[PDB]
Assembly symmetry: none
Homo-oligomer: 168 residues x 8
């Protein structure tokens, strides 16, 4: 994953390094969550494989104009699965445009460079551009988690978008 | 819901009253969660209806032999949906047998006495008897939430079981 | 405030007395708070405020409290409901419905202030019906089961 | 200390029992503090004796008119010392009058029934009646702890009142 | 708000920009908070509010923030100062001294609201000099070193 | 463990039953914990452990618990006492005094482990009298009134 | 311990010095702890323990610590890794792999104890390969992102 | 206080600046405590003066050999009083030697450059060298706070040392 270089008009993705984590410490939690996507359509357990064999990765999302790390993409591989979520810097003016571009970049890489039957992405229901990026990448809304996400004055659903190979 | 009386060989369900909540305060959290089932298959929003119109209910699960409140069933209605989860007393010797019986009791009541297109139940992957009760009630595993539930020394998946009317 | 009784269809409010506070103290012997700062020992800041018990009419149970803190110009309200209470939002909304017109028809105030959590649908609806509008919001200040909600400050200015 | 019975016009003091602690659990913390009086004039360590030999006691303060436990007096004996603090119920209308009476009752008992060279009492600077009770009992302000006590909108000093035998 | 600059003898306020927020985010990479709810990702509740950076004139350092949330009738202020800041109370008081007359001489508001901790002597003194009076008090809502202080809500009504 | 009774001058230990756990659950409906992680729903990690009630002889009250978790070679003990309990340290020390010789005279163990807070004088003294020595210390893991104390792990190896 | 160097393929351990501790202190200037009780000021309890720095060979960075506390019979280990560390579990496991044989081939101990979180797969695997077995479990004592994990105490007895 | 320069063989004291506070953020709490010395002999309130007139200062303690900030001295002036406490870096090998030197440096400065009737210093009972420095500076133990300070496995007293002008 040291070779990953996925660039668009505004941002590029590359392996997150210790330097990134340190600078972003105020908002980026380095500690491991239980998984990189909270919920998923119920499918055969075997697709995930053994926990010893799970592989976690972190990609920095880097703004081209100033080289600022503006977010991260956390990815968790199982045997035939990839699960991911994005963490954008809270100081960003419009996190959604940059998150959406990052999703456009990472999905085709995930489909091509790996042997996956399932791709699973967390996207909040108010993340318009990111939802649209997922739809154009051929992902489909699979799970609704009602009011799972705190916003100012209200809560919104967390949605889980998936592409699942026909074989499954 | 004051008329509800659903009894099996071991437990019965009736409206939870303030007395129950007070006695069970050590383990029963009276505060509202965001919903009664955390995740669900992605279906049309309209099925849930407006939040002003949502109706929440609490059923006590009562052990017949001694009249002890051994758990609760939290139910959240939307327009055409019912979502539920169980909270069993931590001092119970075998919570799963009694939870499973409670699920056997509450499901047929939910199908008959209400006009539902969707029933949604949270069940942890290690809850053997409760899983079996759900399957016999005609519910099917719809969502997997990996390692969502803390246990001693390890974590287990939360599963979401559903029955969804053909019309949907 | 000793001769004041505000009666609605479900609850009534009257001056809270020591015995009420005795029993409300246990509305905190709990591992699941909605907020932090039981009650504490009550010049100059302990002069401005006053308590009304919310009593359910059906069984005469004390089911909540309404705290009213005064400025020269002002009155600010805060509710605390028993944790085991059935239909707390309906009852709290009714108390608000009772206290606001009292503060209007029996006081001369430039500003009435009320604290209400962002998820308290019925209490919010009664505040809006009484003419109050949201003025301040404090993010994730109120604890619920597995999540937090914002505290809203509603105000009317006459 | 089962024989203690110290009564005034309004309250009496007797050994606090498990029943008291349970009822008062909302406001009374049964857990041990490090001592029963936080600060004291610096005097010879030997006066306190060994920690194995320390003896802690709890007296309930009981309102005569209704038998309500309205507070507690926590006492810590060393070899030749007695240290104490009061915890009054937060629902009390006028805690200070009842605290002050309790102090009037407990001090003469402490001087007579025990062989003390030092008595040490915590009293907040705004506790008028309690301060006056201490002065009339022949205690003197020895220590000031500035702004140690939170009140509504402001903080007040904790004062430590003492009587110390001439021999010391 | 992009062409607005309020200059006092020590600090000036101007619209906060992304770069300012970038560096202010670290005013939370800390085990010693004064409050809880770094910043979070910014319809309908994220429409009403606006940020001003407080910049120290001597070295052009961004040393704090002033958050202004609007109602139709209202404006409510909240300050956050860098944790390492020398003389934070003097600088915050000066910012208040600057923002209040701006909200008066350049807006048409019925009510101005400001949050101030009960121990912020100089900020309180500037609020009183600006005509604001305490309206609401929230006990022990602000964390300090080994103790907590109350949050006060000050208001003026024109 | 159903036919096991260890009787001392003040308390006795026997297998804990559901009814005991029912009432012990409330030893947590409280805002003042000594530790965190009421009880939780009890393969493979829920196989190794077992509970003994500590019953006060004078009134037959269940006043505490002794949790014994087993390895192939090992036994590890943890006590929880009712919060309202008079003389909890004396009673807990006596329970320890009872359980340790039982684990010796009626089991074949290479290692016995016990958790004890650093301020539990009498419990510590009984652990030392039973031949146990401190092995591990976890700083400020136990909450007391206005302070914390260390958790000590004592062990004997036969 | 000043002339002790344990070198593996990825890291090596040597006596920790003041400068290492200086920089490790910031492994706590953070709002996301894994545990509680930065470091604190170091008779009689501050006699038994000792620190080894874990240094990554590729860049000579100090990336973690190994704390060894001694009894007469005993040695107990505790690791703390830098929060930004890549592959912390692999590196920690390697340190364990290095320290255990050292405590065997260069000490005379009846019991070696190690703390390891229940989710630290590779560290657990090295403890089992070194002959250690789980002895004690403390439920949900370690904080992770949005959840907690148990702390396990592993031990070998020679 | 920008002119303060107090140097000994090992450390020097100078005004703490924002740079110091930032670097030391892991261990140095910039937030204000209620006072700089927790307890003090009970003397006339007027000596402290008005809170509006209180002046707080921070001195960095700087190790000469490497210019490292190894601690801080927090000082609070009232009208005729000075109260202080030290915060040493936790990574220090022997904090007590350097704290003690810092106390040797700051006391004569406090007596000479200011018009004080009272100097009040917090010192833990196990801080041998610091206690000895205070004694040689002509301070005397005035207050004992039993077991106020957590240490590894045990607690120690906080002591308050004072010099008080004869006039008082």
């Amino acid at each position: 994953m040291q070779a990953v270089y996925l660039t668009g008009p505004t941002v590029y993705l590359r392996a997150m390094v210790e330097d990134d984590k340190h600078h972003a410490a105020a908002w980026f939690d380095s500690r491991f969550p239980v998984n990189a996507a909270r919920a998923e359509a119920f499918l055969k357990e075997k697709l995930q494989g053994d926990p010893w064999d799970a592989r976690w990765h972190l990609l920095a999302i880097v703004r081209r104009s100033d080289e600022a790390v503006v977010g991260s993409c956390r990815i968790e591989f199982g045997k035939q699965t990839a699960s991911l979520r994005f963490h954008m810097a809270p100081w960003l003016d419009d996190a959604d445009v940059l998150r959406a571009e990052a999703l456009e970049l990472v999905v085709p890489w995930l489909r091509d460079e790996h042997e996956l039957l399932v791709i699973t992405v967390e996207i909040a229901a108010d993340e318009q551009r990111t939802l649209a990026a997922a739809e154009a990448a051929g992902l489909k809304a699979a799970v609704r988690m009602r009011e799972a996400i705190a916003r100012a004055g209200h809560r919104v659903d967390l949605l889980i978008y998936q592409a699942v190979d026909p074989k499954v």
